[PDB]
Enzyme design. Sequence first.
Site, PDB file in Angstrom:
ATOM      1  N   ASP A 121       0.876  -1.222   0.000  1.00  0.00           N
ATOM      2  CA  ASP A 121       0.000   0.000   0.000  1.00  0.00           C
ATOM      3  C   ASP A 121       0.905   1.262   0.000  1.00  0.00           C
ATOM      4  OD1 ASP A 121      -1.763   2.117   0.533  1.00  0.00           O
ATOM      5  OD2 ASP A 121      -3.016   0.829   1.838  1.00  0.00           O
ATOM      6  N   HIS A 160      -3.532  -1.072  -1.551  1.00  0.00           N
ATOM      7  CA  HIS A 160      -4.824  -0.540  -1.082  1.00  0.00           C
ATOM      8  C   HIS A 160      -5.961  -1.197  -1.844  1.00  0.00           C
ATOM      9  CE1 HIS A 160      -6.300   2.668   1.573  1.00  0.00           C
ATOM     10  NE2 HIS A 160      -7.263   2.938   0.709  1.00  0.00           N
TER      11      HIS A 160
END
Length: 233
Positions: A171, A202
């Site tokens: 992420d 994400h």
Amino acid sequence: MLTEGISIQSYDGHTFGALVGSPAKAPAPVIVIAQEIFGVNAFMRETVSWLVDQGYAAVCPDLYARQAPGTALDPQDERQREQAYKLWQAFDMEAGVGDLEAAIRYARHQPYSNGKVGLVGYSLGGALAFLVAAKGYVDRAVGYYGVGLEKQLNKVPEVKHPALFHMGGQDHFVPAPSRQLITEGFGANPLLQVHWYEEAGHSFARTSSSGYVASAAALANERTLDFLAPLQS
């Protein structure tokens, strides 16, 4: 989309709608779902559907209603993503925690409720899940990839009920030093669990994301279900 007719009132008097899924069989614990940055949209409806199939009732509140009631944006449309980012940048986190507190109270008292309430949030809802865990409003909280968690670590000792967090190792919102601070900080409170998914970034649990990773979504989701299961009668 929201369930027409449903209205929840926050401590400050503000009212907002919610998408509600009654349980297959009652009584049942109720899960409040905290949205991503796109409003209450297809992925929220899919999550309500999933949790009802797993034996829960679910309530997903319209958190952007202080700004614009009924927002439901398509994560694949660029113009709507632009509108989502604008809404998120303007979003009042403390008021969102208060709106979730009100949805949690509502959830405790539905006819179908067994009295236990859990919370599962994604992205923006994941950052809100940590803040709700620090306040202690629910029996168990789950967050998927909240942003800025490394800035809220002074709240770690405030957590007094179990909370689980799923974070993508790739992420871009969480560089290595942030991941280390979170890991070290969570380690001081055994009521907190954080798991890292090394091949995911994400939004890895949403099928419409270009960042969807089925293996990480599935592991995280089963851990979420095993963690909420004790709320079941």
